[PDB]
Amino acid sequence: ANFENFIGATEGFSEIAYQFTSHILTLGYAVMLAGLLYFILTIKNVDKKFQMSNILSAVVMVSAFLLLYAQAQNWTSSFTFNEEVGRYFLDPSGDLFNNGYRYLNWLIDVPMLLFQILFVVSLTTSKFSSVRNQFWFSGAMMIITGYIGQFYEVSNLTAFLVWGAISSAFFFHILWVMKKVINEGKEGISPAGQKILSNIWILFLISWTLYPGAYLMPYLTGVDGFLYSEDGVMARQLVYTIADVSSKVIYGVLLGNLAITLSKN
Ligand SMILES: *C/C=C(C)/C=C/C=C(C)/C=C/C1=C(C)CCCC1(C)C
C-alpha cells in the first residue's frame, strides 16, 4: 500500500516516532477548530462585499477539522505496541493507515482556497469565470493524478514519480494563473493593500510547494537513505501539518486583513 504501512509492517515505529506523529496530527485538527471559531467570529469586521472569503475560510476549516481528525484517529488506531521488540507495528486486526482522508480534504479545499481570493481582489483584463474554471479544472486534475501516483508509492517508484510529475504540471498552471490574479489585484489598490498581496503570494507559493515536498519526503535521500525510514514518515506528517496551517489558516487570516485594508479608501 503506502509507505507508512510498509515501515509499520517491516521495521515498526519507535515510541517516539509514533507519539510525535500522533501529537502533530492532533495539533493539525485542533488548529482548524480554532480557525473555524476565528473566521465565524470575525465575519462582522469586514464589509458585506468581502464576507464570502470569511465564509469560504470557515467551510475549509470544517473540511479540514473533520478529515484531519479522521486521519489522526486512523494513525493512532492502526499500530499496536509489541512488548518484546518495544516498537509499534501495523495491526492486522485494524483498518491500516489510509491516506484517503487527506486526499479527499485536498479535493475539497483546493477549489475553495483558489476561489476565495476572487472575492477580495478585483481582476482587470482577465475574466472571473475564466480564472475560476482554470483554477477548478487544474486543481481537480492535480489532486486526481497525485492520488493515482500515491498507489505506486512502494510498489513502483517509476510510476509514482511519473504521476507526480503529471500532477506537478497542473500545479505550475495554478501558480501561473494565481500570479496573474495577484498582479491584476495589485492594480489600483493602496500600497498597504499591495504589500499584503505580495505577502499572500509568497505564502501561497511556499506553503503549496510543501505538499509535493512531503509526497516525495521518503525518497529524498535515495532508495535507502536516512528518510527511507520512520524519520521520513515523521517529516512527511510534520511538513503536511505546517502546510495545512499555512495554506488554510494563515492564508485566510491574510485575506481577511486585505479585506479590512481595502475597506479603508
Ligand atoms: C489544505 C490543502 C491544500 C492546500 C492542498 C494542496 C495540495 C497540493 C498542492 C498537491 C500537490 C501535488 C503535487 C504538485 C505533486 C505531487 C502530488 C501532490 C498531489 C501532493
Numbering used by the authors: 8 to 272
Sentences from the paper on this structure:
Here, we describe a multi-reservoir, high viscosity extruder as a step towards automation of sample delivery at XFELs. After commissioning the device with lysozyme crystals, we collected time-resolved data using crystals of a membrane-bound, light-driven sodium pump. Static data were also collected from the soluble protein tubulin that was soaked with a series of small molecule drugs. In two commissioning beamtimes at the SwissFEL Alvra endstation, we validated the general performance of the multi-reservoir extruder and determined 13 structures overall.
Second, we utilise the device in a time-resolved serial femtosecond crystallography (TR-SFX) experiment by collecting structural snapshots of the light-driven sodium pump Krokinobacter eikastus rhodopsin 2 (KR2).
